[PDB]
């Protein structure tokens, strides 16, 4: 997109001290990694899914059973979910600034408190929910070479082999670690606000 | 597209309070999901359609019978249909504003009533029509692993297996849920108007 | 293209009342439909063309016999043909406007009559010619599941199966219906002009 | 390219009356056809080249023998060759205009005669040379379904079948016809100048 | 990206004498090499990985064992890691310049010392770490034609063959050599600084 | 890239009379040919490399032995190497012009001599080196249909067949011929400078 500098620049202006660090980690180490590197790693996820069997349709159902939603698609949904609360508030800052000018460090004074605090709180919950889904659905952050499958129409148990499990594990750990960093950064911004008003 | 900021910004100016929320849901949670994630899920719909048979041409007719229109193609048509009534009115709002200046909250004063009210009414009807088609043509919002097919030239009944049914079910539920939200948002705007004039 | 807003905006300024409606139908429901939906429906037209035979080269000659020119390529040529008469006149209006300023509703006063009237007349003829070719070459607007082929080197008659025929029929009906609407809109603009000058 | 409007607009300003017609035929009916439609017609030229043989390497040498240069690659080279003489002169017109301003219909007065006349003359020769190569190398403008090949290592004569010969023939006739139109338009511009100076 | 000139130009302004040389080596000989040429050298890395065996899943586990992370993915991560410390400081230089103007050779005077010195120091460490990982994981900078694999489920030892090993070795040597040049350039900037303050 | 007009225009301003011709040949007849036509001539180089053998891995090692570096990747490296000395000097010319304005034909007066005379000299050496590598590694500028291969693990000698050798020979001759023209143009600029200073 050609307007990336426009939106990133706009969000950068309407942010606190820590909040500008957050935009760096979100765009550089989450969007760029997902686009430049991660998406190509998952490009052949079903094509080189290999199952030791002669049963028609067994490969289709075994891949579906073990990867109900792809990792990269899960990360794409997470990025969209944690981007809207930031962009909506940043848009609201412009409207508030627009009213004053019609009469550069962002300060929370009035009703902006209940929007900024909610946006920070929502982003913490959204990241935690996706982190929990990643752990529960994939029983950890390590991809296995071999999966054992017994869903119909596979006879008894069938051995199946995943494409590039180690490279996928490496990028999974990277995305989870960065996401945890974003959670820590967001909690500090709550601590900064929670000691200004209620302390 | 590089002019997305131009059109989205332009439509944003010529909108009511709720109408700006509706534009966020349409572009973030419908267009971005369709482009970033959904389209790749359906990329191999016919390629890994697998049928347990030796009959030439049976795979072609069984896939055609069960997927007369792809889900992503249905969503692409729906997005275009529900975007025109909003864009046409927004253009008409600019012309009406253009006339006044030649002599920033949009207010429905005169003939704009019969355009805005019709534009909202059309969007509700278009969204409901596509939701109805999605339900009827696909007997619900869950994709099945196995489809049983007996169209010519398949001998008797043939078992066929769908690619990534669970991933496709997840994105189908997401898209229908968001469209239902858009319908609810549109109905409220009618309620806001229907109590100003006729109440 | 990034300059789409520029050319569409320029054509929009130099147009009549109905002519602006024609612009939306051409770009929204014909170009966007062809680009974002229709083109990948036809992406695998020859790849999943399946013929029940063991004869080398029979699949090649049977596909060529029944699809001498692809539907989407036929629509690409038609869109280009019906776009030039509109753009050629539009730049001529700019030159005429350029002359007057060197000394915003378009009015047909002088020599613009024989350009605008001809451009409308040419677009009706171009659209009718392509609508006629579509009917004659494909014996109607419905694509069949099975085609029977007896061209050399196929032995006797060979059964062959088309990829996604129902999907292709749906988009064929959509494109023909919209193009027929454009003809009706074009004829009215002739009626508006005809009753002004010769009535 | 996003700067297409810039270069086309720049070339449009520095041109004669006929020369502006030549710009539309070159870009709309040659570049757009080549990009939008023609290129994907040839996308599978070697992939679905089929030969009735069991000899390894026979398909490779038979395709190479009969298509030493691809049609679309031949058209891409021709378009580049006939675009430079126009762009170089148009750039030279800007420099001449730059000198006068530092002291909108283009007229040839002095040294511009020997540049404009040469540019027109070169484009006629370049187009004729490519049209002659198309005829001589491909023994006409009709692609055949069957080619008979006896180059080593093919045993005796081998039958081979071309992908989409009819669609390729249709676009070949279209490109040659438009190229001949451009030649006719260029000769007229020579006639216009040849009666101004030497008559 | 269309804003590349914007960011590169901005980084170019806020740099020292040597730091502007480092910008060209990073963008021209590392980013362009990776994008234009290297990436599609690795495009078929697993597709033409060939193993002499009949064992299902042996190709999957042998490729994973010998290429836990792809070379081009390793270079993409390295480029991102060594770009942020330069971009963050260049952003900080703008803020420092912004404060002075609100009251073109960059000079380190105050707190900029501890940011610039750390930014240079981090880049040396990041580059050395990736150069060390490249050597240790791939036992050198030369890719072998044959790899011997005995991981489960391969029986005994299996011979496997890499796609384009000489081609990949050439680009590996090129990328490592340029990174060593960048390390040498960065060390000199430390020497320039370490003799101004502490000498 | 959208900034191509910006960089090409900027380089065009800061150049001599001949240097502007060399800009045309480099971009139109080398970059455009490489991108538009040549690159996808080589798109299938290894996929349709065919070897008459049953030995696993023989195709991999025979292709690697005869094409250690692809032609298009060799050309991509050469284009980057001969572009940097021109761009670096042109940037230096801007800085020199910046100094004078802060106090349109480029003239070589002072320190610009040792930069310009070296950029020209480097470009001649870089082009000659790549022309030498092309000749030595590929034993000439003609690609052969058949290559005979005996590297391990191929048994005795194996016959292998190249994809589109004639098409590749035609583009190889074109690229070498243009490169030789650029060398001749560069040598003249040395002659122009040589007779000014040392004659």
Numbering used by the authors:
A (entry chain E), B (entry chain D), C (entry chain C), D (entry chain B), E (entry chain F), F (entry chain A): 3 to 105, 124 to 219
Article, verbatim:
We show that mutating K125 to glutamate, mimicking the negative charge of carbamylation, causes Cx26 GJCs to be constitutively closed. Reconstructions from the most predominant class from the K125E data set (K125E90) have a nominal resolution of 2.5 Å. Overall, the conformation is very similar to LMNG-NConst with an RMSD of 0.35 Å for 195 out of 199 matched Cα pairs. In contrast the RMSD compared to the LMNG-NFlex conformation is 2 Å across 180 Cα pairs. Thus, it appears that the K125E mutant is sufficient by itself to bias the conformation in the absence of CO2. The effect on the structure of Cx26 in changing K125 to a glutamate both in CO2/HCO3- and in HEPES buffer is consistent with the hypothesis that the CO2-mediated closure of the gap junctions is caused by the carbamylation of K125.
Connexins form hexameric channels in the plasma membrane known as hemichannels, which can either function as regulated passageways between the cell and its environment, or dock with a hemichannel from another cell to form a dodecameric intercellular channel, or gap junction channel (GJC). We have shown, however, that connexin26 (Cx26) and other similar β-connexins (Cx30, Cx32) can be regulated by the direct action of physiological concentrations of carbon dioxide independently of pH.
